[PDB]
Amino acid sequence: EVIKAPEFDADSAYQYIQVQADFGPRVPNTQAHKECGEYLAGQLEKFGAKVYNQYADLIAYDGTILKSRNIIGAYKPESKKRILLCAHWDSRPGASGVGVLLEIARQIQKEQPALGIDIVFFDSEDYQDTWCLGSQYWARTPHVQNYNARYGILLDMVGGKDATFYYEGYSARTARSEMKKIWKKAHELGYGKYFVKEDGGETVDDHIYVNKLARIPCVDIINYDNIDRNTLKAVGQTVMDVIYNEK
């Protein structure tokens, strides 16, 4: 049978977005970025995840050494059966995906699903191989040795009013089964307006690397043509009903 997941609180996710936004743009090598990283690590700790902070000097396209910090929160680290949930947290010279995941973390704390969940915030994403430096780093060499997950869900720009998440190109050739499952649940829950079961665009994003350096099929939930609580609720609830159904 099917389990109905706990209720995702969209106003809570909205506030996590607003707190990130209040640091100013989280541009690599800035005070805003440093402070926001501390905030995110702290929140994943506050919400019961086993926190793994992954510091690295990543060289950007112009030679800039980015004092990078990938942030990982693990739930039920005992379980070999796991689902990866991820988003990037830096800003371009972010927030929405991270905000939804923090609210999912908080709910995991209140009631844990059957499988282990990993929440990973990738850094240095937005500064083709010179994008996604944090996930390239992470997938190549994950936070635990031999890391695996059944599949992964990437959230990127998931807060816009009347957003439409199409079948993203890379996800649709590397993770159809998983993507179709997620879009299925969205429709069943009444969020079909948001999850359009049609091929959209193909985008360079963290899920490309996750799938390659770490080999986990990974679905990108990304708006395809501002912050809205209804959009957050549709994304967040769909992700919880999907992950709480995993056995």
Q: In angstroms, rounded to a whole number, what is the distance separating the alpha carbons of residues 62 and 1? A: 53
CATH number at residue 40: 3.40.630.10
End-to-end CA distance of the chain: 11
Using DSSP bridges, classify how beta strands 195-199 and 165-167 pair: parallel, antiparallel or unpaired.
parallel
Alpha-helical (H) ranges within 111-143 are 133-140
Indicate the SS3 state at residue 208. Answer: helix
Backbone angles phi, psi at 195, to 5 degrees: -105, 90
Residue among 191, 182, 160, 21 nearest 89 (CA): 21
Q: In angstroms, rounded to a whole number, what is the distance separating the alpha carbons of residues 33 and 215? A: 29
The token pair at 117 is 């969940």
Backbone angles phi, psi at 82, to 5 degrees: -145, 155
- Angle among Cα 213, 245, 228 to the nearest 5 degrees reads 80
Resolution (A): 1.8
The token pair at 76 is 């039920």
Residue 115 contacts by C-beta under 8 Å, 6 or more apart in sequence?
76, 79, 81, 82, 83, 150, 243, 246, 247
DSSP character at residue 158: -
The full 3-state SS of 37-57, as one line of letters, equals HHHHHHHHHHCCCEEEEEEEE
β strands within 123-232, DSSP E = 151-156, 165-167, 195-199, 218-222
Q: Which domain holds residue 182?
A: 1-247
Taking CA atoms, 239 is separated from 6, 74, 141, 195, in Å, by 11, 17, 26, 12
Q: Tell me how many domains the chain contains.
A: 1
User: Do the Cβ atoms of 227 and 162 come closer than 8 Å?
Assistant: no
Tell which phi-psi region holds residue 31, choosing left (phi > 0), alpha (psi between -120 and 50) or beta.
alpha
Q: In angstroms, rounded to a whole number, what is the distance separating the alpha carbons of residues 111 and 98? A: 20
Instruction: Return the axis-axis angle of helices 10-21 and 31-46, rounded to nearest 10°.
Output: 150
Name the β-bridge partners of 155. 221
The token pair at 165 is 């998440």
Taking CA atoms, 11 is separated from 8, 43, 183, in Å, by 9, 16, 23
